[PDB]
TrEMBL record:
It comes from the Eukaryota. This is Radical SAM core domain-containing protein. CTP binds at residues 7, 22, 50, 146, 148, 171, 173, 224, 240, 271, 275. Residues 1-208 form the Radical SAM core domain. It comes from Hypocrea virens (strain Gv29-8 / FGSC 10586).
């Protein structure tokens, strides 16, 4: 298993409360910058070409984040450095200062109907304003702009083509709501995503309406369950499909930890996990 593409969820804290979140604020723990850099070095030596920064909200700690993006690009010479964020805490000067080391910046927006963004819980109804401003900043300092969308029971009938034809992200991830055991599957967890779930037919309603876009990347449940390399806030590997957890790579190493998780490389390539992820 060559971990060519890794998501490092370095924090679990966030400033929003989307009802379907499958990566909840279980801990406020965060790794040290020496340990995180060592973990990113360990993954580089195992073959990782693309790092993606995620978790709760990465831009809750823009000093920690920016330190790691300059590290991954200047020191580890990673092919792709990417970030996924809800966009609200991004400051323009941070983008300007770190544009050279960022290949992709992804901002989440699940609807362009701000009432549904309130119903979802991603804020108080300004996500589209946040969204367009992030994309404006990306095109200024020449970062590839990417958009992530979660298709729920409240927005699968939504026609988004006017906005997609305007933003024109180079990459548009379209997730079906995923139920992850122990994260959002009941009322004993920090979120109850059961009200947002849709069927394979309801998902296809949204997909057929929008698949014509080149950026469009459809990610149904079967393509999301085990197609990812999930790195914990302790730098452990998460198997969210099987509800399992490894020891931190900092102690047992990359290759020994990877052997405990399931990673569907077949679904990884089906979802176009490998792509032209570099430049600026
Ligand atoms: N079972 C899953 C599946 C996905 N994710 C997370 O969902 C997030 C959104 O995915 P995306 O932004 O598409 O991840 P990238 O790795 O950046 O995808 P790509 O490289 O293809 O752009 C990722 O952080 C991933 O870790 C997760 O927590 N649990
Ligand atoms: C968990 S978030 C955290 C990163 C950042 N705060 C953001 O929203 O972009 C990462 C991505 O996963 C998506 N996501 C969260 N919960 C999900 C679920 N249950 N099913 C599918 N996607 C989900 C979010 O919309 C976001 O695009
Ligand atoms: S999804 Fe909504 S809640 Fe879960 S992390 Fe990203 S922003 Fe915070
Ligand atoms: Cl672009």
């Amino acid at each position: 298993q060559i971990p060519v593409s890794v998501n490092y969820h370095f924090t679990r804290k966030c400033n929003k409360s989307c009802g379907f979140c499958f990566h909840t604020a279980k801990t406020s723990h965060m790794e040290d910058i020496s340990r995180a850099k060592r973990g990113l070095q360990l993954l580089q030596r195992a073959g990782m070409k693309k790092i993606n920064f995620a978790g709760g909200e990465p831009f809750l700690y823009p000093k920690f984040l920016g330190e790691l993006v300059d590290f991954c690009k200047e020191d580890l010479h990673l092919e792709s450095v990417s970030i996924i964020t809800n966009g609200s805490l991004v400051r323009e000067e941070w983008v300007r200062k770190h544009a050279k080391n960022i290949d992709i910046l992804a901002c989440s927006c699940d609807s362009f109907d701000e009432n549904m963004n309130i119903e979802i819980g991603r804020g108080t109804g300004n996500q589209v304003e946040i969204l367009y401003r992030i994309a404006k900043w990306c095109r200024k300092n020449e970062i590839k702009f990417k958009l992530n969308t979660v298709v729920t029971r409240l927005n699968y009938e939504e026609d988004m083509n006017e906005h997609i034809d305007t933003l024109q992200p180079f990459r548009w991830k379209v997730f079906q709501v995923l139920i992850v055991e122990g994260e959002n599957d009941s009322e004993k967890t920090l979120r109850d995503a059961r009200r947002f779930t849709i069927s394979d037919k309801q998902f296809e309603v949204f997909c057929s309406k929008h698949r014509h876009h080149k950026s469009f990347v459809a990610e149904p449940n079967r393509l999301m369950a085990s197609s990812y390399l999930l790195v914990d806030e302790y730098m452990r590997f998460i198997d969210k499909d099987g509800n399992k957890l490894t020891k931190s790579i900092l102690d047992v190493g990359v290759e020994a930890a990877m052997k405990e998780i399931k990673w569907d490389v077949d679904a990884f390539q089906e979802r176009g996990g490998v792509y032209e992820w570099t430049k600026e």
